[PDB]
Each structure stands twice: as structure tokens, then as C-alpha cells.
Amino acid sequence: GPLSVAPEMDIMDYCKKEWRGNTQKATCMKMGYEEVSQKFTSIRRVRGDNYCALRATLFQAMSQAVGLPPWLQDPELMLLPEKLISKYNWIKQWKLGDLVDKIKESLTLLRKKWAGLAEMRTAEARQIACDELFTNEAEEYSLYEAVKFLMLNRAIELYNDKEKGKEVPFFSVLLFARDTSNDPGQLLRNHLNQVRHTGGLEQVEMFLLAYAVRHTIQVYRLSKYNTEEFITVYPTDPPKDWPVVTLIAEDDRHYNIPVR
Ligand SMILES: [Cl-]
């Protein structure tokens, strides 16, 4: 299929095309891209479907992969679908974009593709391979099923910890405080399973994504330009060894990729 992450263009050329006229909104977006352009020369437009946040994060993480992270080296990763689904039968309410084999196939693909990218000598070889992977075919969307499953697993672990009275990060309190997401089944049914053209990860779920792939996500939030949220980092205090990926969000729903 066609690329789902568009070929790069100059970031201020992009800004000048999208943001014209003298509205306060347009002025704030221009200031936002001007600030981003101090560190990144170019931008890649990410397909704005319900997977936009996952696509943006995974494309950055994988195109920048120089090693296979320990959580993907762990043999437990491939055992997780059978162990989780056997224990929590409501997971079979999963809606795909049997279940154990499908998820295991997706996780095996994620691990294999990531390992192959980490094997490459140059960033250019990685970008070519990523440009082939993110072409709107079944392999791309299988990656999102894998990551969504790891998000569900991390959510179950955080929920169970909070039940036991163990310390949990506060974003998980906020995640489960939502009336549509009071427990992991509601998270699955009402958020991870969601309907086309309406879904996408909410702010609190960006923390969950970061935890699931062990990446620090640095987001220029342009609708927050004149506030301390002009950047938000997910999670707030990650391990220093987690790799950093940078995104741009004009609103708190759609993400593009700055590149240099
Ligand atoms: Cl033009």
C-alpha cells in the first residue's frame, strides 16, 4: 500500500501551508512550529486514523532502534498472550483491527522486525526498512495489535497493584478514574477496541503507551504553547535508560513526527 508516514518535508514549509491568516490559533501554531524548528528541520505527516498515536510513536522508536530492548529479548513476551487470556477470559472481547495465536503472531512480528532494524549498520538502512514496513498493509496493523496488547497487560498489572495497595504512578489512578475506564475490561471495551474515525489514544493513555514500550515520549503540544505544557513528557520521571522519541501534537489527538 501507500506510505502511512509521509515523506519528510521542511517543517516551516509545512507550517506555512497549514497555518495561514491572522487568527490567534494560527499565530500560536506558527510560534509552536518556529520553536520546534530550532531542533528539527523536517516533519513527517502521520496518517490520522485511530492508530495515529501508535503509528507516530512506533515509527520513531523503530526507525531509531540501535538495539533490541530487554523487554523484547525476554522470552516471557511470547508467553504473555496465553497466560493473560487464560487467566482473564474477558480479553476475548478483543476486537481485531483464535485470539492467542493472532496476538502471539503479532508480538513475534514486532520482535522480529525490531531485531532486524537494530541489526542494521546505518540510520538510512533503518529508514528504508521502516518506509517499507509502514505501508498500510497487514504487517503494519499487526504491530498495533501487539502494542495494544502490551498496553492492556501493563494496565492489568497497574490495576492489580492498586488493588493490593501497592504504590502505582498517579497517571494510572487518573486512567482508572474515568467512568468509561474504571477497570481493565472497560479500558479494553471502551478505549482499546474503539470505533473507526472516532478513537485514538487520550492523554492519560499516552502514559500507558510509554510504559508498554518503555520509551520516553517527548511531545510538543502546540495547543499549549503559552503554558508550561508546551512540552509534556510521558512518563514524567522515566528510567534514564529508556530511549527518547519526540512527537508534535497540534491538539491532544493527532501526532506528527519531527525529524533531523
Ligand atoms: Cl504552497
Residue numbers in the entry: 78 to 174, 183 to 345
What does the paper say about this structure?
The deubiquitinase OTULIN removes methionine‐1 (M1)‐linked polyubiquitin signals conjugated by the linear ubiquitin chain assembly complex (LUBAC) and is critical for preventing TNF‐driven inflammation in OTULIN‐related autoinflammatory syndrome (ORAS). Several studies have shown that OTULIN binds directly to the LUBAC subunit HOIP (Elliott et al, 2014; Schaeffer et al, 2014; Takiuchi et al, 2014). OTULIN‐related autoinflammatory syndrome (ORAS) (also known as otulipenia or autoinflammation, panniculitis and dermatosis syndrome (AIPDS); OMIM ID: 617099) is a potentially fatal, TNF‐driven autoinflammatory disease characterised by sterile systemic inflammation, recurrent high fevers, panniculitis, diarrhoea, arthritis and general failure to thrive (Damgaard et al, 2016; Zhou et al, 2016).
Together with His282 and Thr283, Gly281 forms part of the Ub‐binding site and makes direct contacts to the proximal Ub of M1‐linked diUb bound across the active site. To understand the pathogenicity of the Gly281Arg mutation on OTULIN, we crystallised OTULIN's catalytic domain (OTULINcat, aa 80–352) containing the Gly281Arg ORAS mutation (OTULINcatG281R) and determined its structure to 1.8 Å resolution. Overall, the structure showed that OTULINcatG281R adopted an OTU fold similar to OTULINcatWT (Keusekotten et al, 2013) without any major perturbations. However, comparing the structure of OTULINcatG281R with the previously solved structure of OTULINcat in complex with M1‐linked diUb (Keusekotten et al, 2013) showed that the Gly281Arg mutation partly unfolds the substrate‐binding site. The introduced Arg side chain can no longer fit into the narrow pocket between helices α3 and α9 thereby flipping the Gly281‐containing loop out of its normal binding groove (Keusekotten et al, 2013). In the mutant protein, the loop has increased flexibility, as represented by the high crystallographic B‐factor distribution across the loop compared to other regions within the OTU domain and also evidenced by lack of interpretable electron density for the side chains of Val280, mutated Arg281 and His282. OTULING281R was ~20‐200 times less active towards M1‐linked tetraUb compared with OTULINWT. In addition to reduced Ub binding and activity, the Gly281Arg mutation caused a considerable intrinsic destabilisation of OTULIN.
